[PDB]
């Protein structure tokens, strides 16, 4: 299930950390952004809505979906400071 995140960016940036791109897939077959980590007192953790295992879909007009790595981590760190970020729920369990 598909939900929209309002978040500021901390000075240290959104507080997650994520796994996964084309050529560098985190589950088997998938090429998505997965979030591996949430940092506390960080702006997602804060908020409460992001949890490990989520995939990312946008951050503001930022499509992360079938990007590389490299491309969804300068997505996050080089966004405004008012982020909206696009996600999904898992079906199954875990990432």
């Known amino acids: 299930k598909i939900m929209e995140i309002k978040l500021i960016k901390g000075p240290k940036g959104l507080g997650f950390s994520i796994a996964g791109g084309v050529g560098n897939q985190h589950i088997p077959g998938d ?3 997965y979030v591996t980590k949430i940092i506390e007192g960080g702006a997602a953790h804060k908020d409460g809505k992001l949890q490990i295992g989520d995939k ?3 951050v503001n007009s930022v499509g992360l979906e079938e990007v590389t790595h490299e491309e969804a981590v300068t997505a ?3 966004t405004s400071d008012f ?3 696009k996600v999904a729920k898992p079906t199954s369990m875990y990432i």
């Open 31 to 33: 090429n998505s952004i």
């Open 76 to 78: 996050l760190k080089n």
């Open 56 to 58: 990312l879909l946008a």
């Open 83 to 85: 982020v909206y970020l």
